[PDB]
Amino acid sequence: DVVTREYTINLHKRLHGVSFKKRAPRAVKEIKKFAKLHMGTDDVRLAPELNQAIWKRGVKGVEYRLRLRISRKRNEEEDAKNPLFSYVEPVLVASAKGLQTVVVEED
């Protein structure tokens, strides 16, 4: 199904204990795994603005909580093996605390 949701990912507990030189690359991989877990798609594409937010404070300064918008969409190329894929984009909020998973009514 074509669907769009907004999630909060707790990067603090997913990055607990990771070496400082690996925190932001590990966050990239964790977000890919998180999107795969929630949408079922093995093809996760991250927005460069999302990567910018991840790397905002250097390689070892990733934020504790991140508000994401994940859109599972149809692969309209008809070339890739997976029928669907997920696109992860950042959501700009003052604070990422206290927010629950919501459904976006795309219009």
Partner RNA sequence: CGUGGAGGUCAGUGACGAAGCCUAGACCGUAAGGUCGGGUCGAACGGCCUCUAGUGCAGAUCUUGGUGGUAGUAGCAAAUAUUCAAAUGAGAACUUUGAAGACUGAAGUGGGGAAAGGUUCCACGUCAACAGCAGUUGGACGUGGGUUAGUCGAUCCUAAGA
Partner RNA sequence: GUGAACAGCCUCUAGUUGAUAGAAUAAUGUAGAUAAGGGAAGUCGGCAAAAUAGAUCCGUAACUUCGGGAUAAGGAUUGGC
56 binds RNA (CB under 7 A): yes
**Toward RNA, which CB reaches closer, 5 or 26?**
26
Q: How far apart (Å, rounded) are the C-alpha atoms in residues 97 and 37?
A: 21
Q: How far apart (Å, rounded) are the C-alpha atoms in residues 71 and 4?
A: 4
Nearest CA-CA partner of 1 in 74, 107, 86: 74
59 binds RNA (CB under 7 A): yes
In one letter, which amino acid is 103?
V
69 binds RNA (CB under 7 A): no
At residue 18's C-alpha, the angle toward residues 13 and 22, to 5°, is 120
Site string (21-40) toward RNA, x via CB under 7 A: x--xxx-xx-----------
**Toward RNA, which CB reaches closer, 3 or 47?**
47
Q: In the complex, which residues of this chain contact RNA (CB under 7 A)? A: 19, 21, 24-26, 28-29, 44-48, 50-52, 54-59
